[PDB]
Amino acid sequence: LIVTQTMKGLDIQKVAGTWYSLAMAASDISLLDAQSAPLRVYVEELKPTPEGDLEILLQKWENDECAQKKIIAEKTKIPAVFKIDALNENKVLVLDTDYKKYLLFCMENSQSLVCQCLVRTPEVDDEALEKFDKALKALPMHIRLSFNPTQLEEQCHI
């Protein structure tokens, strides 16, 4: 347990659809430094399921190419927290969202941590980035990236 910002009253069905990973940050440089860093991921679309799970579509650079990936994030008793199935138990938290402009989320292993500021459009939203920086102030981050509108329209933010 590191992250203790979490969204009260989250309606998961309302986060469905298209998102842009405007900014990312991580507790360790090596998590994000290279285009093929294991947790450098670019979100494309969120699809909550009827039973309340969250399917995620994203792009990740893997074997010298921008790959699509589908990940299912399973619900827990807490509406703002989900579990991804990997070797270690990996937990996704929704910290804050207004549904229509921005969504802040972090993923952590259950010590290491990656967070992103998601936005609805290919636009630099200073206000969402402010909320992002405010939430991160509380956290031990050592690398922060942000992307411009041109990169946001490219595969793997090229």
Added chain:
Amino acid sequence: LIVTQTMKGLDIQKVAGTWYSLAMAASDISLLDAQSAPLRVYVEELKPTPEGDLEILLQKWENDECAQKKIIAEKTKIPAVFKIDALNENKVLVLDTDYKKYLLFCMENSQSLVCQCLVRTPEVDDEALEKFDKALKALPMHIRLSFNPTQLEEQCHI
């Protein structure tokens, strides 16, 4: 011309000695993303010359190894601004320093920009990082790194 924070009354001889690159930031991700990024440099020591130039010692990761480098930065009519001799005209500005704890500087080409928060000791100085973030608010940065006390004592911040 992008950077317009600059230190009034800079005494260059007073910046002599040992420094740690606690944090770095750049206008473009590719300037700093990989360990061999052209402007990922770790400052070791500053040596102003008698005629008022500034010699810099630092480490840079080049051919799969941490290399030492010596750079001379030549004075200009402005005490806080220096010129490094490369293909393009490259300008170094000292934005702020208290001489004994921290020093903020940026280097720019004369469009692209790299800045660092230098500290005297292998210690996370929240106050200097605050001054760093305040100065950068004004600037279009897209990648920010910071290093912990263990990394600060290693060659090339390994």
